[model samples]
Target chain A: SAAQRQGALAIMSRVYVGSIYYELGEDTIRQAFAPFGPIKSIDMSWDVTKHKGFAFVEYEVPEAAQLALEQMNSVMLGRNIKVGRPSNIGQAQPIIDQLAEEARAFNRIYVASVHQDLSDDDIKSVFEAFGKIKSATLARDPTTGKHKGYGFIEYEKAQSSQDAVSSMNLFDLGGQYLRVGKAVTPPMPLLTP
Target chain B: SAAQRQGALAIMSRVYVGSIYYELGEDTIRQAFAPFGPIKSIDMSWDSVTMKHKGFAFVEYEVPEAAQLALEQMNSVMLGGRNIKVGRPSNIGQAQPIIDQLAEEARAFNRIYVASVHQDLSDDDIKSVFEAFGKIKSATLARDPTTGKHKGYGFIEYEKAQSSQDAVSSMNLFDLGGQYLRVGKAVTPPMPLL
Candidate 1:
């Protein structure tokens, strides 16, 4: 089912303390898999700002995936190593489901054109200019405590979302007008019919 | 003093290509060479995209003289059932030397046509043949679009100007698995060899 969903099995492995010292860099990964089949693509994800040492490898075929497991798994890099599929599969769930399910009968409002300087207080103050405010959150990067430039505002009542949307939906901030609408999961505003 | 400075060349015999694959990865490299000599370090390079061997690897000896001995003595050693040719690393001082060599001697040898190629030729197999005299610029097995079967003929580019001459002189056209590899400079306005 995972293969059908993603079109391939994305295999990943962890790096131990001495793992980085080994020259397993891009070249090793390529040589290990070329025999199984043609590799369509590869991405070695590295945490640039921190020391999170791990790489995610995507294979183009299930046969290649199996071969990697059989040949490379537990074959050792510096010390004995472990090679297996990724964990934390739940983190990949649809973002829309999290939003819609949390804010069911509450106000359905969409926010657009949010700015870097727009904090929660700033958002509440601006939206409150039109009506009473309830709850508001500016989406932020979980790893780095910075605004994601956009967020959703849950009003005290249903009419609050509608009132804010209608009144301040096109108000310009500096040079850009903030967009407003019903907050959909995954936050698709333009795709709505 | 020389032995202390650099390790002795073990002159290991019987190491084959298949064993080279199993022995190469991140861990096996050090394990395999440490006992044979004073290994300063073991390093290998492979293609990340294809997961294939890069055909050649660099094994640094503790001393320069030990390295030289290994180069001379281990020129061709059979290991693990396959004969492997080893030597000092090729110099690439001039970026286009091999290419210039090919263009200069392109017309001397009659081109031997390798019409149908086996789809299973690994990159290592191809390199073993071409690396003897010069670098292989490129090799490919054509395929049928609808059926996806190999149409077979791939081309190899050689350096040393007369390496092609030497290759055709020594090798049988169809010796390895009856796959006939045509050897010679291309007849047309020399296309990109790949």
Candidate 2:
């Protein structure tokens, strides 16, 4: 379904307008484009405490923005206003891609209830049969650097981690039941009275 | 600034297109309207049991003007050899009174209070365990906002009072993630707290 595939995209129509007179304020910007359509928002850039001679205008509909871009670009606030989409400005695309890659790197499994004396290599060997192990590290006390009875295993493929979770979860290992699942970072503490 | 005032009204641009042929699917609809503008979504009302469309669809456009233009230009336009109807949806009227009454009834009987929740147990975990009873309206794990952590107690509200009662009886001492749960009727808030 096209609807199912569309996912979430920003619906607000935002157009960046540049080269505004420093003397003009947000009201002047709105009056310039109010003739086109309903104004949704306007953000004037600032340098320290002074106006930066540029602003962004958001319209209730894209047509109003398109109309403003075409008609008001050349003349607004008694000066030539530079109008275009926000994405055209700055290195936004590359920054977004870098952030997405960082997010994907966090996919791993958190295992608990392993004997505190178990070494990181011991934990890694147990999971090596599943698939290629990326990194398996046992968590330790930050101050003492001693094993903290829990650790994490990141797999090269998400499928491998999922297979380990389904196969090893609740399995008794080294005189303790191993609790295994997707790693939840900044682990929320279990509430207890 | 007028721009500051404009921040409140984020109008959505969605249109309903009806009278579609059963043979046509979502991709066909996308091809027919892709020229107008970027389409956010296209939801064809489908009957899974019959494996066919219900002959209507909802299309959300990235911009409201695109929806307006499509409605103006595509109304009664031929697609898949059939003229289809397209128009903006009328504002759905609210049943505030009925909703208020249901809320009052829900408050009176459909809510349960749970205690002794593990600090690590999330609101979703609580909901997942109780969902077997019936449709739940809400499941809240009380937490300190600053800490972003659970506080060992919570509330669950079901759409039906019977579901709430069943949950209370069956889950009173149920084990959840190694913690024995304590479930009971919601205590009425003290007047000072209210």
Candidate 3:
């Protein structure tokens, strides 16, 4: 019943359409879906004025929205259309915070803006010049298995973390400046990408 | 005194040629710049106020050598009695949304548009820049047809989609030449990636 209620709520609220054509004419969309019985709004969507490949179309009645979703979902509603992945909306926090909070304090140096290919060995050798590295961690994308352009290195000697940060705060490697800083305040959140 | 002054001025040179009415034609500008030590053609883009053919050109290589001569000389020109101002072009920004949206709608999700690229990077250089991540299906440097120069941005598609994902995440803020790189997924209309 709870699952049905959640479904009913969305059926009334809006349908998120991912992968919509950036230049799809509004007149065309109105022609297609208004036939399903009037959508209250579509991704007003300055967006299509040039935003994401996504949109939102809400209907006044839950049944109408449900019909629209079933008819449209996973099928090209017209040209450049995808029905929904509404669950991914509003990721309030980047998942990286979870790893940072568990990392060592003072001894850890968080480095942002690195290539996915910027490997564990690459970071270890760069930081180890000052002292031995205890461990180095790079956030990885589970879906694609690539670094999300950042990493954290903890040193055997906390002073090594300090040395690396001072030397590399804005050092250029592969044309990207290393945003290096101590795991001061806390290990979580973005440190300026 | 003149010889000493000449060296100092060359250091400040690197001209951006602009505002020539489209009617003036490319050769008209070329002839005007020819006096400045074997002037190489500067490729102009259609990205500016002039709409398409009449934007601006970068006179980079020779400007370093003939800096003040060309810069000051061009500044004084009274073409049609309209004074022209010379300076480096600010960051040129725009996107190809229609093409990107097509790629997404068709599920050709592995392509990325990289902006602020060095205009001088060759097709090979463009490929080489992203080759570190994976095999490239194709690397395209958007070139202006009238002036044979890149539009300061390019598209790269990997043979494997993961490579595109990896490149976008890791290379977004990387610098190349004098500009910082901005990489993102290009969204557009429906079409098979092929």
Candidate 4:
């Protein structure tokens, strides 16, 4: 039942919009919410032929979501639409746990104070002595593919990674003292997952 | 000065701790965070009169690395019989502006005007039907002040715009116990005498 399925989901801030026009795409939706704040992502439902007249628009912050709900309710876009947080009753939890476990399996490290010309090979050469390197990549400008003076290293063994962080921190590489430590990733998406 | 301050804060995560014990003090604070990660400093303002903790502290980690884990694990942890709060400092102060903005917006609600309500239905009955949509700030049934008889019309004010629209979509022309009701967003102000 719809009532039974809506159990304990009233507090969520993610806004759900339904009865949307079939032709509306990311651009139109983004334009509507551009006045509020930055949008995090948009998950639209589609069938074989057209959109399913629904989409979930998540804002980078909760305040934007609240503002959109207040300002955009019953506003026409080819047709009137409904917007609110969807109920999360009977949602799957095991899949969420599996995804979390996969993310935690990789031991990550942040390497700062690297020179701009340092490639992945250059960074890997400095830390590969401690353990087998799974990946060593420098952050880059997506448009130009130029190094951004920082990179991340991941190791298969957590202990080896810790050893590298302890030993190589402040070690001079490429005429610069490297600032090495654990890397932090943003929180996983709740509604999309 | 601004550039120096920005450079120092680039890698650090400033965490706010609340509900701290006055007597347990700085040693207990260091012990709780030391195992999770490295600490740069811990700042807790002191009370000049009692010479004790002010029940809150700001802890800065060397890097943003373990701050999220520290926040998730240390929040609500029992310390000195008190469950302490731990999180990023911005989480406490960032919500106030949004709340103030929402409060300002809530004042101008598009109220749901219901008609043909049963004479026997009281204020509570009308409220219960409309509350399913969202939070109701107020519900009033129109009645004659002289005779105290039902006028068969009422108004419901919700806290958000979506709630009033939901009521109109779902409850307009809804049948309620031998009386059909008409519901829509009110276009005009109601008479004060009723």
Candidate 5:
């Protein structure tokens, strides 16, 4: 609830509208929302030919924006409109990263192609320069009881995790090149198989 | 039904991953999928308080080629219970058309039914009353043509469909002459003949 309040405050004056149809265009949205109050701007995200699944409607007053969300949410366009703050709202990476930081997410990397001989401590020593270590684990083969060529590294800070993935991949480690990438662990994918 | 089964598909390049387990984690997904090409982002629909993802996630690779290869390689393969379908989500029309058809039909019911109206009220009276809500195209109180007896009901048609919606909600079950009115959108059933 505390964070929700903080989040609401961040985008209170702007309502995010999602799944806007390519055919509907901006005027339809402008007219549908115009009745509520004076709108300051209607900024939409677009792909090559259509809306990028969402748009932003900013009102001069925060209360008006709130009212627009209350009345317009779940109202249909091509898609049932979802009026709320999105991760890409304002297209502000600073706030986006801040939100991820607050959520304590996207902060781990799967290190593939680890040298078969590198021990757990060696994996830590190599990635340790990126940030404070939370943990590191090397995958061991079930049948042979030998370490596989991949492992996972986690960092205490989100940026450190991101930084390591950026810098560590394709770098020579124990004569084997490592592949570093994000591990999305929200409940699962990929292979040990 | 047989003909309906013969269609094909397309991908907007967004990958949907579902039925994943928390233990499998995003790291493994990236590890397995990263070989194809770079990934732009992976967003997991998560439960706020618990470490559990809401059992679904979407992965966006940096290129459609990468997404295509990942889809071919990973779909229906082992990923926390062989439940992943690594490809595009349902097309907008297929998924949203059911309710949209309902709304489309409702838009045509632009006429309203008002009954238990005071029999003494004439077409003009009903028109004048409902016209307060919007411009009325026509209003007719039902009458027995042979006996000329009032049937206690009328249909009010409006120039704009939205006005009928306003009229129905504004006046349904309204009281007049000690009779509660039954008001609603008038739907008719019929077929073509000569």
Candidate 6:
């Protein structure tokens, strides 16, 4: 249960550091506190295949993050290493706006797999169940106006945004569970045809 | 400087795309539009290092309202000219039950305890600096339980990690002109991190 509690705290932190990126390897995490305290376990929560560069540094107590912040806040890890406590996910309009813009500029909308033979309208209907719908689109052929079978939905507001994404994602939809986020756009040509 | 300081609309719709999927990029994206007013640019953002798709792109419009209208109309627009999808840019922040409840419980997780004061700054000055980030659940500048001269530094506990990062990234290097600011984590020694 302690792992569960720490997992909850880690989620609250939202600061994910990858396991592969650490210069000192797994040994550094085990010896993270050799200078100030005794030994402890360090767990890297990220999958090894993707190399996401996030890990868990568990000291004797929750105070480890606090202590690490104190000693490492401005100190370099190895060669120009940047270390600090995990960032807060408080709602800031500019930040959300930036993220939304990034989503748009990228044109890739992450979508959870669905199975109800839901048309674009049906998908909108399901997503709207959570909060106010801003805009939802099912990828379609421009010339024929037919469904490409995948799409994205954006909420009118960002507050309930992540909650909606997490709650409905990776579920059995149309008999298959989905992994949703920003959907990737197709490639570009030298000139518009 | 003026061009460098463009409006929020400039950055709103530019979607970043990967080179691997670069072939059908334009045709696929334009299909999502309802053929609105004159469009400006549609470019995919590629990671400078890998030169691969960051998995998103943008659509810059001559007008912000047009981009807003497109965003509104294109919800659930398909991708690859086939996949069913949805689209919205950003949302306003509203209260959430879970976050609120967590905030309430975290009131007891206070860590930093300031005990002295640099005569240059007042408690109000410190509070004003942090207010830009998020709601300060509670802030206490150490005072004599009696005479109450200012305790040099104070404790600031934010509602989330992003807020704290924003504060650190934005306000950490503030200039009090000549005043020295010793702001860092408020935890016990032996923590061994900055």
Per-prediction fnat values?
0.00, 0.00, 0.00, 0.00, 0.03, 0.00
- Per-residue lDDT of B1-194 in model 3, one digit per residue for the tens? 34433332232335666555656555666666554433445666565674567555666433232433344345433343333334433321111233233334535546766665775778898799798889998888766689878766666878776677668656765777766566665543112223
Model 4 chain B is weakest, by summed lDDT over 10 consecutive residues, at: B185-194
Candidate 2 clash pair list: A3-B42, A40-B6, A189-B120, A190-B119, A190-B120, A191-B118, A191-B119, A191-B120
- Candidate 4 accuracy as lDDT: 0.61
Chain B TM-score, candidate 1? 0.35
Chain B TM, every candidate: 0.35, 0.42, 0.45, 0.42, 0.43, 0.34
lDDT for model 6, on a 0 to 1 scale? 0.43
lDDT of 1 by residue, A107-180 (tens): 74645457777788998888876567666777666799886555667777765665676566556886756656
Q: Residue by residue across B49-96, what tens digits does model 5's lDDT show?
A: 985778767777543334544544454334322345454454545533
Model 2 C-alpha lDDT per residue in residues A62-152, reported as the tens digit of each score: 4345445544544442224556555442333333233334435555776666786789998999887788998998766679998666667
Clashes per model (N, Cα, C within 3 A)? 26, 8, 9, 0, 8, 107
Per-residue lDDT of candidate 4, residues A1-193 (tens digit):
2332122122223566665776878678776754444456888887855778888887543334544554454334312455554434125223323433544656777676677677889889878887998888876768999876666788878866767766676678778766665543212233343
Off by over 4 Å in 4: A1-103, A186-193, B1-194
Candidate 2: residue B163 lDDT (0-100): 83
* Prediction 6 TM-score vs. true: 0.24
How would the docking of model 6 be graded?
A: incorrect
Worst 10 residues of 3 chain A by lDDT: A88-97
Off by over 4 Å in 2: A1-105, A185-193, B1-194
True lDDT of residue B114, candidate 5: 71
lDDT (C-alpha) at residue A122 in model 5? 93
**Lowest lDDT block of 10, candidate 1 chain A:** A9-18
List pairs with backbone clashes in candidate 3: A47-A51, B100-B187, B100-B188, B101-B187, B101-B188, B101-B189, B102-B188, B102-B189, B102-B190
Name the runs in model 5 displaced over 4 angstroms: A1-10, A77-79, A88-193, B1-194
Candidate 3 residues A63-152, lDDT tens each? 344334444532233224544323332331122233234344447776765755788788878778979888887767689877666666
**DockQ: which is higher, 2 or 3?**
2
